[PDB]
Amino acid sequence: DNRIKTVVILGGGTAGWMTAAYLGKALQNTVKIVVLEAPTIPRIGVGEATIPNLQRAFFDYLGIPEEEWMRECNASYKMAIKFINWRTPGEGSPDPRTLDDGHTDTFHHPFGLLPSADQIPLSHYWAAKRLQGETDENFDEACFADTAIMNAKKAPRFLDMRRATNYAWHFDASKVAAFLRNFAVTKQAVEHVEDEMTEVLTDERGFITALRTKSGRILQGDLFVDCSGFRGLLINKAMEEPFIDMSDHLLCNSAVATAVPHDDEKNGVEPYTSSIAMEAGWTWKIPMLGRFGSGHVYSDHFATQDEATLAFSKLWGLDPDNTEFNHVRFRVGRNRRAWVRNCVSVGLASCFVEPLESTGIYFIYAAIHMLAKHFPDKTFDKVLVDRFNREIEEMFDDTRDFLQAHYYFSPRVDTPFWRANKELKLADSIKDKVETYRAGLPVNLPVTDEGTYNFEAEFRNFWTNSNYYCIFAGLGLMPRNPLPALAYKPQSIAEAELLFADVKRKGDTLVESLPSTYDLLRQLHG
């Protein structure tokens, strides 16, 4: 028997306990699993947003019903990120300004799928009408019924819990971590050691053989997962793997965050995350029951901590001297290699970008999924390690480029921060996609439909034509001209008009018949 016998996970939180719970299921109790977690002083729950495959890819794999975990972490529903004031100058404001053409400066990035007509996505029929002066509608409201539902703050399910739209989740990440810790310990025989690490013991090749704890106990293991956060205590410190700083692609490196009590009954509950543009970054709004989490992400080369705190405070009318804040400096980028020898980094110890498209928990599940797939024995086949590393770096760099496009194509030039974004080099992959987009062509057509988007189908097709249209057109970047094939296809244009009319009918119907997000949440948590 040459198998891995013991896996030691360094660090708790969502990364450590997702890893522990997932491997507990994937390895079918043939492996001992140990989590070494230093006890931590609780932080205020500033909220976390996610993407729709979290339930299918992670909680269902574990056999955990959606409503069961939701009720343990104050979770709410998310149908999109709503971007506010990314095109107009001025101070941070929760309220959207008005563009010069009279439109309000908001656009949505929903999870809905785009239909097509004659194998051409609905986005392209919209762009043709918009460029030809035949519609004044925005892309998001023309092409997604979800837009009208979000404008009315209606829920993504009926009260009888029948699904109406696709959606993901807002939640308190420390409560999810605590939920998963309890599951892993009581249902999967994970050993939880509450102690600090003092020594990393290695063999002549630099493979880790054990971790020593502060109490002096030695935790032997065969494979070690670094979930220690930005410090990368195993992968960076002990293993000396270099971290590749990518602040030449993304400027924001800091956040100041809190949780704000919210009057849900007076204001309702928004079924979406808001990304509120600031002078030196952006601020997230993550509604939950009774409160929303909020954090100002900024570059400390363009705002001091006090400047960012005061603008964040003024955003919500908070007393900057009488409110509890969490401050953090980010590490933006990724390790040269995510997995070195018998040390696999997961979460922030592996890589990080700001949560501008809610990908943080996804990077964790994707890594643990790829680890289970590439799971080694004690010979540590270097091809397994290399293919794992290739997957992590391509996943990360692709989302990094997608995020840079949010800043590079914002029309804002009113502060040093917004101008500095346009002095950055655009990655070649986005330059290529923008050139494709501007010729009128689709960008990364999706391959499957609602259901399959099957973890592999989504991992390989992560940002598709719909996503690039949401961000490019939302920011005001248009194709130079319509897709030229449309000029030859009068019947396909007519067929797309009927699709536009179906989107209107469905959104109208659902806006009238759905319960409020507030009412669905009261029932779910009541």
Curated annotation (Swiss-Prot):
Disruption phenotype: Deletion mutant cannot produce thienodolin. Thienodolin production is restored when the mutant is cultured in the presence of 6-chloro-tryptophan.
GO molecular function: monooxygenase activity; nucleotide binding
Active-site residues, as the UniProt record annotates them: 78
Self-association state and partner proteins as the record states: Homodimer. Monomer in solution.
Further remarks about this protein from its record: The reaction between FADH(2), Cl(-) and O(2) produces hypochlorous acid (HOCl), a powerful oxidant. Unlike the mechanism previously proposed for the tryptophan 7-halogenase RebH (AC Q8KHZ8), which suggests the formation of a chloramine intermediate with a conserved lysine, Phintha et al. propose that the conserved lysine likely protonates HOCl during the halogenation reaction.
Family: Belongs to the flavin-dependent halogenase family. Bacterial tryptophan halogenase subfamily.
Name of the molecule in the record: Tryptophan 6-halogenase ThaL
Species of origin: Streptomyces albogriseolus
Top-level taxonomy: Bacteria, Bacillati, Actinomycetota, Actinomycetes, Kitasatosporales
GN (gene name): thaL
